[PDB]
Design a protein around this ligand. Structure first.
Ligand SMILES: O=C(O)CCCc1ccccc1
Ligand SMILES: [Zn+2]
Ligand SMILES: [Zn+2]
Lengths: 137, 731, 698
């Protein structure tokens, strides 16, 4: 019930915002970028991938992909609610500038809202498709 | 100019009155006008020897000195959606490539022809070929992780001696004054740790009435006491960190903690920064004695002990490598009044791309010079630009191989350098050799490329490219010699020689460099005959031998010599020359032959004097530019007009003992000397304090320790040194 | 009247013996069915006795050294007295030189048997309170816990010292009042610490940086307690919070052990859930696995019990040796781990409070009874009690059962056969109240004598010595068992026998020993023809002993199942401390009946007493329940509907552990508590089987 969260433009896979804390990240970050590369305009808008002890969850809105990784034991019900909170905030704040930027991580300052929202889901006190990721890759 | 030969025994006044200028590589007119700025990139031999045999005959070290992250006046920023890079050696498209097919370019470093992609548009007019210095926008594949935010963690020693030094007050004051001026956007994080015999964390939550001091006393087993509010967001918690900085100096006034557990404290600060990385500022005031990383006391040498350096442990070397692997850089602020084994503590910054700052015998009341020096150096340290999680690679045309690196970094694989931080005041040096004969080419090029994360969260690449010609004549190699660059490369080599062998071998290798080169010159041509490019070679090497890094008979202490060597390894070439051979001017009679052009100011240009007491005068006053300071020495029989109109005093006896700076009086003589001084400190981003304290009896006449041409009781004079060299040249 | 005798001797001497006439021969001492024992209350209150402000006289004999008592034979002419225990004759001290017949000292008068002296040992130490606070609980529980701790701070004496230790994943020792900075020392709740380690890592009346006078610190503590926030470490899905109860307690113990050893100190620990990490771990952090139950421990499916119990057992002895009191206040929905931590408040004089949440009237009011004061504004608690018992040369002490620890003192009054905490003439009771009752078991190896001497630290700081000297008649050789059978205290024996059974169950069949003595007592003192069960009768002195045994062998003290282990250890804890009357209420709850036809009247604990047109009031010592029959479950009807509610409120205040109040009726789920205490299966059947064996072989 952990972390990895990325927001990327579906067209070219251009990263827009992310958030990662360790104290590996190297392997599942590649897989995350492999998925951004494969996603196109015929991809399922909401999907879940299985990667052994891990599990990817993503949605797609306005050509923008909201990917999250966690241990498979993390509730898939909560994973999509976490991405929905990110989408509505991101589209409201930067949805009209996304198809114009070209730099990687042109919205690093979205780091703040990701992590303050991230903690509202990784604490039990605070209170679709499925396919093996090795296939799509 | 001059292809002329010089006799060092007859001139004896060879130093020029105007500042030295770096040599111009003997290149075609159109190539040299695009060449790299010599301040950022320069070579000891502007005419590269064609073969290693020729290089050995010259008996001169071949290498490069670079200042890659220097503050620039104008920087071209290419935002290309594609970075053209040679498909073989990954060399960036530089102004010195060879465009042939107008759609194919020949790599000037590995000679492979590459295809100009149809994104390159009149392909030879693109900015990547019109600027040797240029900064790229790194794509998505040039970063291992999202750009890390700027993280600043300050670590203060609060032992009994540290509280006595009073450093904690002004440091917390400088942070309060420059809190908004720290490089970073809204992602900036800030933290604090104090320590004595225990580690003291500090949490900062807006829900609590005051910060909380979380003490971990398990010295042999450190941990992080809280997961959230130790490294806090500076933007959101500006108010919380301001109170703590106003409260920190008052928390330890009555301390009895005589010991310091610096080792475990640095392990605590590493674990806190390991998740994200960043810059770690450590303020230490005494020998570490408690816990792991403790060091034993040493007895300071005297003028009598011979040349009989290295770290006494590897803990701080290992700990630096751990910080380097987590993109953490450590900067050491040593304000010690006694021996502290800096030869060991320095390893925390040498292998993490940091830098050590030394303030000997710091005291808030007793030592007003070190107080203002720390203030002005903290001003630069807190407001200069910074790059995070950086790496650098130095490329050079096939046939030239780099084999030794000099500077604060960690070399991973060959021709690579790990820079947890990269600061605009760091200098680097590289020693190379001719692995394959340069019969093919007549031009060789060098390229350094700095991949880093900006304070605004943007991956960038700064690329410099230098191009030089190849020669095959011994005299041609001598004609392109850069005496300053050779002196700087020899200093870095001599420091390594000390750690690897002894100070004696280091001094001998320096002396043998002048002998073997001038004897090789003589064997290919009565007095001491040198080419025009090396007329200042023995002078600068002698000044190198009297510098606090390699001097012997001086009463210098241990940490002084070590810090002197840490500056040699980490300073750009200019400040090494200014420290080794300071510029001495006479300032009690300035007038107009000055560079007024500046609008409303006139700015006198007095002639540079050679470093000898024979040039001084008791009738006047003399200013010495040591690079980092500006000592103004006043004569005893000094004129009365200089006393009342420049110093603000009626006689020599009432010149205040420690004078922190000149007054700005309503006199034309004050306006002239204030203009000459301010012009000096404008040539540098590190504000040098100026103390007139250098009277004829202040017991602070280390102004005279820089008179490197006179003889002392334990060193030769410049004329004696010339006499010793000639005896060896034609032995 | 023997009943007037038992009443007046408990009111005066705070003691009730199983036999008030003792076997004068070796042939009857060995054949005693119920051992000669005493329900001794060392600090019982009474009609304002005079505090003797002078040091007690003692016997001048190295071994004996008893206290001058009314049994002593005096000689006001020669200024000499003869000790009743060892016949040694003493000289009166100089302060007794003006002794006279028509004005003699207080201890001698038979009214001033059981008297208290006040002695001066110099400066009196300040009292010490150490709050140990859990931070792993809900906000409404933590906010209520904070308010309760702030209220207790307003009652503490200005001289007393206070210390705050909060914990969760880590343990925090707070250095009080360091002005504008608020510090604390952080320790991993993963590895234990000894006192010497904790002393090195941390560092006119005395005080530490961690223990400061209330009058100088009460404002900073009441603010820190007001800012205490829940454990900052997040709790992932399906996981319990990381709670280091075992190390937090050991750090609280080691702190006082190296700062103020051998002085009144109270370690008040507050728990919101079980210990999940470290030594003393009670259950894992996986919500999938439940906390152990009695079924789990019987089938060897509880891997933390013995290892965790051993940890808190060594902590209990560490604090009891140092002389410090360990309180435990646990409120949660799940279990807490009282079974593993029971020894800390049992071996010391520590309290044990249990509820569902700190945010209830149940915990809030129970917590402020702890600091109830008497007619001088001082707490009704004593510290560091030392109980020493002098006996005649014919009496020996087997041992004691109750909140005490052996000082392992050897002497001729020690018996070979030891019982409970035995093999000693001296016991230490780190905490005691006017209610603490030890069970002392004697053995005979004409007027016997027993002298109880209790030295303790008072709430005022004064050192006091309670001296109670009782005397019971030796049996007449020509009327041995007839007098013994007349001096029988059926109530006191039933609890003293219950004390033994429970102590054997909690330190493991027990019902078998309880029956073989019930049958033996029926045969020796009952009336019957052999092989004729219908002939069996019992004297009015013995008739209630069978019924007290029926309820005892069916109570929740010995039938642990259908209860949680924490509930079982909580029930045993209070039964091993209470006096006679309250202990009878536990074993056999009292039941009152309320109807139009007559004022409130007590009725039998039988199903025949549950009428439809009647309101019942059952008083289990742990719960006060009001039952409404099917009829009444709907000004005259009001007098009835609130007659039990009125009588409930009165007793609903005196009792220290405030009993859980219950309002139920016929068909309600909470009526189960009445049907289980009511009603082998039936008394009638139990009595018949008892009579068939009583008239049968011996
Ligand atoms: O392997 C590499 O050289 C590419 C990554 C490091 C680097 C980046 C930019 C410039 C120089 C070096
Ligand atoms: Zn190439
Ligand atoms: Zn006696």
């Amino acid at each position: 019930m952990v972390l990895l969260t990325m927001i990327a433009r579906v067209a070219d896979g251009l990263p827009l915002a992310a958030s990662m804390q360790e104290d590996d990240l190297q392997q599942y970050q590649s897989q995350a970028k492999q998925l951004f590369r494969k996603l196109n305009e015929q991809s399922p808008t909401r999907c879940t991938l299985e990667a052994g002890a891990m599990t990817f969850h993503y949605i797609i809105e306005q050509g923008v992909c909201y990917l999250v990784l966690c241990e498979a034991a993390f509730p898939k019900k909560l994973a999509f609610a976490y991405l929905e909170d990110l989408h509505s905030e991101f589209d409201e704040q930067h949805g009209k500038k996304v198809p114009t930027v070209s730099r990687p991580y042109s919205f690093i300052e979205f780091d703040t809202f990701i992590q303050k929202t991230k903690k509202l889901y990784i604490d039990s006190r605070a209170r679709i498709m499925v396919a093996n990721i090795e296939e799509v890759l | 100019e001059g292809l002329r030969v010089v006799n060092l025994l007859q001139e004896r006044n060879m130093l020029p009155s105007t500042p030295l200028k770096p040599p111009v590589p003997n290149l075609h007119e159109d190539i040299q006008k695009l060449n790299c700025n010599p301040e950022l990139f320069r070579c000891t031999l502007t005419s590269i020897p064609q073969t290693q045999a020729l290089l050995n005959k010259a008996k001169l070290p071949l290498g490069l000195l670079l200042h890659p992250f220097k503050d620039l006046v104008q920087l071209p920023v290419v935002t290309s959606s594609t970075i053209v890079r040679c498909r073989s050696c990954r060399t960036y498209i530089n102004p010195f490539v060879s465009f042939l097919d107008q759609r194919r370019w020949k790599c000037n470093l590995c000679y492979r022809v590459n295809d100009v992609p149809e994104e390159f548009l009149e392909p030879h007019r693109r900015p990547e070929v019109q600027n040797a210095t240029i900064e790229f926008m790194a794509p998505s594949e040039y970063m291992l992780r999202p750009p890390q935010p700027p993280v600043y963690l300050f670590v203060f020693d609060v032992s009994h001696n540290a509280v006595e030094t009073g450093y904690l007050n002004s440091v917390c004051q400088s942070l309060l004054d420059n809190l908004d001026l720290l490089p970073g956007n809204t992602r900036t994080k800030i933290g604090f740790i104090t320590f004595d015999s225990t580690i003291h964390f500090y949490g900062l939550q807006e829900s609590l009435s005051q910060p909380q001091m979380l003490i971990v006393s398990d010295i042999e087993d450190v941990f992080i006491p809280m997961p959230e509010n130790l490294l806090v967001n500076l933007n959101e918690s500006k108010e919380l960190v301001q109170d703590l900085l106003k409260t920190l100096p008052q928390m330890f006034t009555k301390t009895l903690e005589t010991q310091s557990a610096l080792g475990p404290a640095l392990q605590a600060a590493f674990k806190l920064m390991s998740p994200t990385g960043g810059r770690m500022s450590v303020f230490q005031t005494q020998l570490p004695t408690l816990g792991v990383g403790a060091l034993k006391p040493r007895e300071e040498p005297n003028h009598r002990s011979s040349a009989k350096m290295t770290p006494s442990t590897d803990f701080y070397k290992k700990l630096a490598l751990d910080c380097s692997g987590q993109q953490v850089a450590v900067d050491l602020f040593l304000l010690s009044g006694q021996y502290s084994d800096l030869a060991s503590l320095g390893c925390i910054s040498r292998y993490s791309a940091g830098s050590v700052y030394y303030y000997p015998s710091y005291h808030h009341q007793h030592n007003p010079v070190q107080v203002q020096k720390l203030q002005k150096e903290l001003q630069r340290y807190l407001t200069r630009k910074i790059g995070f999680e950086a790496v650098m690679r130095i490329r050079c045309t096939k046939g030239l191989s780099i084999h030794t690196f000099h500077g604060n970094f960690f070399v991973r694989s060959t021709d690579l350098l790990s820079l947890p931080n990269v600061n605009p005041d760091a200098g680097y040096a590289v020693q190379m050799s001719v692995e394959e004969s340069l019969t093919d080419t007549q031009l060789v090029s060098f390229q350094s490329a700095l991949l880093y994360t900006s304070s605004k969260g943007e991956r960038r690449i700064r690329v410099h490219t230098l191009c030089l010609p190849v020669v095959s004549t011994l005299n041609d190699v001598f004609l392109g010699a850069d005496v300053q660059a050779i002196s700087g490369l020899l200093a870095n080599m001599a420091v390594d020689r000390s750690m690897t062998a002894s100070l004696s071998d280091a001094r001998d290798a320096l002396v043998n460099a002048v002998i073997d080169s001038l004897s090789a010159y003589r064997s290919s041509v009565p007095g001491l005959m040198v080419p025009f490019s090396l007329r200042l070679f023995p002078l600068f090497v002698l000044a190198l031998l009297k510098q606090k890094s390699f001097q012997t008979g001086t009463n210098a202490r241990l940490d002084e010599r070590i810090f002197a060597m840490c500056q040699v390894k980490n300073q750009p070439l200019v400040y090494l020359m200014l420290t080794t051979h300071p510029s001495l001017y006479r300032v009690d009679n300035l007038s107009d032959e000055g560079a007024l052009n500046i609008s409303d100011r006139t700015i006198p240009q007095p002639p540079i004097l050679q470093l000898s007491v024979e040039k001084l005068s008791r009738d006047g006053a003399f200013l010495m530019d040591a690079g980092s300071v500006l000592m103004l020495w006043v004569g005893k029989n000094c004129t009365q007009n200089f006393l009342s109109q420049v110093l603000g005093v009626q006689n020599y006896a009432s010149i205040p003992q420690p004078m922190t700076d000149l007054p700005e009086l309503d006199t034309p003589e004050s306006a002239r000397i204030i203009a000459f001084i301010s012009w000096l400190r404008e040539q540098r981003p590190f504000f040098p304090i100026l103390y007139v304290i250098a009277d004829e009896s202040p017991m602070k006449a280390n102004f005279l320790q820089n008179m490197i041409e006179d003889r002392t009781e334990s060193a030769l004079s410049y004329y004696e040194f010339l006499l010793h060299i000639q005896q060896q040249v034609n032995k | 009247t023997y009943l007037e005798f038992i009443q007046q001797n408990e009111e005066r001497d705070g003691v009730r013996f199983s036999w008030n006439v003792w076997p004068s021969s070796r042939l009857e001492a060995t054949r005693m069915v119920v051992p000669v024992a005493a329900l001794f209350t060392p600090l019982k209150e009474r009609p304002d006795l005079p505090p003797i402000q002078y040091e007690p006289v003692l016997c001048s004999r190295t071994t004996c050294r008893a206290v001058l008592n009314p049994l002593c034979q005096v000689d006001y002419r020669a200024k000499l007295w003869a000790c009743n225990f060892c016949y040694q004759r003493n000289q009166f001290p100089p302060s007794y030189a003006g002794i006279s017949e028509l004005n003699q000292p207080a201890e001698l008068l038979p009214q001033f048997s059981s008297i208290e002296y006040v002695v001066l040992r110099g400066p009196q130490m300040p009292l010490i309170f150490l709050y140990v606070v859990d931070t792993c609980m809900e906000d409404e529980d933590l906010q209520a816990l904070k308010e309760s701790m702030q209220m207790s701070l307003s009652l503490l004496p200005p001289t007393a010292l206070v210390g705050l230790i909060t914990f969760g994943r880590m343990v925090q020792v707070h250095e009080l009042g360091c002005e504008g900075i608020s510090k604390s020392y952080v320790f991993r709740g993963t590895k234990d610490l000894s006192a010497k380690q904790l002393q090195e890592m941390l560092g006119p009346p005395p005080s530490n940086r961690f223990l400061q006078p209330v009058q100088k610190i009460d404002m900073n503590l009441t603010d820190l307690l007001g800012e205490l926030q829940r454990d900052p470490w997040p709790v992932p899905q399906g996981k319990r919070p990381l709670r280091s109860s075992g190390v937090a307690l050991s750090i609280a113990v080691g702190l006082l052990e190296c700062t103020f050893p051998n002085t009144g100190a109270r370690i008040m620990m507050f728990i919101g859930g079980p210990a999940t990490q470290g030594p003393g771990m009670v259950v894992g952090d996986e919500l999938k696995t439940p906390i152990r139950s009695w079924h789990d421990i019987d089938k060897d499916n509880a891997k933390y019990v013995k290892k965790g119990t051993k940890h808190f057992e060594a902590l209990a002895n560490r604090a009891a040796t140092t002389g410090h009191v360990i309180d435990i206040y646990a409120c949660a929905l799940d279990q807490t781990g009282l079974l593993e931590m029971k020894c800390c408040p049992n071996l010391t004089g520590g309290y044990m409070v249990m509820g569902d949440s700190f945010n209830t009237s149940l915990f809030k009011q129970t917590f402020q009874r702890v600091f109830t004061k008497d007619m001088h504004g001082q707490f009704k608690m004593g510290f560091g009690g030392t109980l020493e018992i002098k006996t005649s040369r014919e009496i020996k002490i087997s041992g004691a059962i109750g909140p005490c620890v052996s000082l392992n003192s050897k002497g001729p009054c020690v018996s070979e056969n030891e019982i409970g905490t035995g093999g000693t003439c001296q016991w230490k009771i780190c905490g005691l109240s006017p209610t603490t009752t030890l069970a002392i078991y004697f053995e005979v190896v004409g007027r016997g004598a027993i002298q109880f001497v209790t030295q303790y630290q008072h709430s005022s700081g004064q050192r006091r010595i309670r001296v109670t000297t009782i005397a019971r008649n030796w049996a007449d050789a020509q009327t041995q068992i007839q007098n013994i059978a007349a001096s029988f205290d059926q109530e006191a024996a039933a609890i003293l026998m219950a004390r033994l059974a429970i102590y054997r169950a909690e330190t493991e069949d027990v019902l078998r020993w309880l029956d073989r003595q019930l049958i033996r007592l029926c045969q020796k003192f009952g009336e019957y023809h052999k092989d004729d069960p219908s002939s069996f009768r019992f004297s009015e002195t013995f008739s209630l002993y069978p019924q007290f045994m029926f309820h005892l062998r069916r109570s929740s003290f010995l039938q642990v199942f259908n209860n949680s282990p924490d509930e079982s250890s909580y029930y045993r804890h209070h039964f091993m401390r209470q006096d006679l009357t309250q202990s009878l209420i536990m074993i056999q709850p009292i039941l009152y009946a309320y109807s139009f036809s007559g004022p409130p009247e007590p009725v039998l604990l039988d199903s025949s007493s549950i009428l439809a047109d009647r309101i019942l009031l059952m008083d289990t010592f742990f719960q006060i329940l009001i039952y409404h029959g099917e009829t009444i479950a709907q000004e005259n009807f009001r007098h009835l509907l609130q007659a039990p509610v009125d009588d409930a409120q009165e007793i609903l205040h005196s009792r220290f552990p405030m009993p859980r109040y219950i309002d139920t009726e016929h068909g309600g789920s909470q009526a189960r508590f009445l049907l289980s205490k009511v009603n082998d299966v039936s008394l009638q059947v139990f009595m018949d089987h008892l009579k068939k064996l009583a008239v049968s072989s011996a």
